[PDB]
């Protein structure tokens, strides 16, 4: 409980690590601004070494020093009372090559990754003739794959009945041992709600979800 790194403190109390393996002012718990989980929500996703770069001194290390090796750990916790119900899925997919809505092009940069701001899924299709937009129908999960089979990646179920939080540890997964970080995004954190959030009248109508990222052993 109350682990600290640099000049930040996060208080916790289970962990699921990578594929079995384990991974100077940059070692601090960055915290993206929390999103709101409503009834009619579909899901959110962040590209991992892009959401850190636009804001942190880790990103100040990025603009001086392009090429690097990093190893992440991710805390995700949502606080809700005993009267809410619903189930999440926290998964961290490597090399998420998403597909465009228009059949002949590829999506542009600002649609694949908001700088430390959560891009959101939807539960319909999207238009095709408009611009370079990410095909974001949720049941195909953006990669043309069945969303039920997504648990082959390292994942952790958040279920508000018993569990409350989820901690992941991801090692460095790349082919080249040293690649430029500005044109490449190797990890992708996805949060999809399967059982939608339901509550009675009188309780608060949304549950906040906070995402805490902390890089460990960044080599340059």
């Amino acid at each position, epitope marked *: 409980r109350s682990i600290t790194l640099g000049n930040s403190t996060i208080t916790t109390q289970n962990v699921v690590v990578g594929y079995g393996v384990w991974p100077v002012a940059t070692c601090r718990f960055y915290t993206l601004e929390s999103v709101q989980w*409503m009834k*009619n*929500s579909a899901g959110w996703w962040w590209k991992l070494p892009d959401a850190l770069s636009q804001m942190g001194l880790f990103g100040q290390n990025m603009q001086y020093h392009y090429l690097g090796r990093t190893g992440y750990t991710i805390h995700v916790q949502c606080n809700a009372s005993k009267f809410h119900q619903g189930c999440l899925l926290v998964v961290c997919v490597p090399e998420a090559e998403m597909g465009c809505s228009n059949l002949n092009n590829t999506p*542009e*940069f*600002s*649609e694949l990754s*908001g*700088g430390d*701001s959560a*891009r*959101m*899924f*939807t*539960d*319909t*299709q*999207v*238009g*095709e*003739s*408009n*611009a*370079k*937009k990410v095909q*974001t129908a949720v049941w195909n999960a953006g990669m043309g794959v069945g969303v039920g089979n997504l648990t082959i990646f390292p994942h952790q179920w958040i279920n508000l009945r018993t569990n409350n939080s989820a901690t992941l540890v991801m090692p460095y997964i790349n082919s080249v041992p040293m690649d430029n970080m500005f044109r490449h995004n190797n990890l992708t954190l996805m949060i999809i709600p399967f059982v939608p959030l339901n509550y009675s009248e009188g309780s608060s109508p949304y549950v906040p979800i906070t995402v805490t990222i902390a890089p460990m052993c960044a080599e340059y």
Partner: antibody, heavy 119, light 107 residues
Framework: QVQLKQSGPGLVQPSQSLSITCTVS????????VHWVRQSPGKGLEWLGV???????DYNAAFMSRLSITKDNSKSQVFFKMNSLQADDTAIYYC?????????????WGQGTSVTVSR | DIQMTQSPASLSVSVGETVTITCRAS??????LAWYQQKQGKSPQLLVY???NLADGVPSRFSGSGSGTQYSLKINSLQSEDFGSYFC?????????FGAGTKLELK
């Protein structure tokens, strides 16, 4: 949260150009796009054009030659120029942001400035 | 192009009734519909996006449904503050077009 406003001329000359600049507040421009909707009492509602969050623009088919939309990210205003300003443009022009939870719908709107073509 | 025909023209029902309203498309839109409400000389607001999902502050009186082409909205109980215009809008592909626009008198 304080929403977006706009500031326009209000009164024009027939067969001219128009310039309405829409001022936003609170949100960025790399995470949202704006929508330009003409509200008219005769032709009803009609959509004119958008500029997406990536910088690409799409226009209406009936106004392909008369529109030109642009924006500035850090200064945080958009600029669009309607041209040739015919007699059917007696209508109030709205500025509205989009991408309400990533769904491409107009969430909040400007105050609306009604323009009239005639002397 | 795709056209939206809002039906019927206008209603005048008392306070507290269950009324319906519908609008039709030309081809498939895959539930990419948005409902709007504008009172006397104000900016419109969003109530239902994607033809099922209510907005954040809109009460639970409104309800929408439909898939494919036949889409509809259902008010279960009117109040004195619910009159005005009502528009349905698809956002499938450019060009985005609106409906015609109806009106509730609330006699």
């Amino acid at each position: 949260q304080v929403q977006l406003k706009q500031s326009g001329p209000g009164l024009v000359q027939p067969s001219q150009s128009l310039s309405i600049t829409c001022t936003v507040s609170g949100f960025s421009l790399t995470n949202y796009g704006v929508h330009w909707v003409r509200q008219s009492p005769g032709k009803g509602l009609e959509w004119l054009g958008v500029i997406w969050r990536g910088g690409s623009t799409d226009y209406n088919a009936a106004f392909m030659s008369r529109l030109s939309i642009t924006k500035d990210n850090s200064k945080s205003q958009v600029f669009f120029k309607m041209n040739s300003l015919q007699a059917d443009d007696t209508a109030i022009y709205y500025c509205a942001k989009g991408d309400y939870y990533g769904y491409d719908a107009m969430d909040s709107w400007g105050q609306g400035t009604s323009v009239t073509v005639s002397r | 192009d795709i056209q939206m025909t809002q039906s019927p023209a206008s209603l005048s029902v008392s306070v507290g009734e269950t009324v319906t309203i519908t609008c039709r498309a030309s081809e498939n839109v895959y539930r990419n519909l948005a409902w709007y409400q504008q009172k006397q000389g104000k900016s419109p607001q969003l109530l239902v996006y994607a033809a099922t999902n209510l907005a954040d502050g809109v009460p639970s009186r409104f309800s929408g449904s439909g898939s494919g082409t036949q889409y509809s909205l259902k008010i279960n109980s009117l109040q004195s503050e619910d009159f005005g215009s009502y528009f349905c809008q698809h956002f499938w592909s450019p060009v985005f077009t609106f409906g015609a626009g109806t009106k509730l008198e609330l006699k």
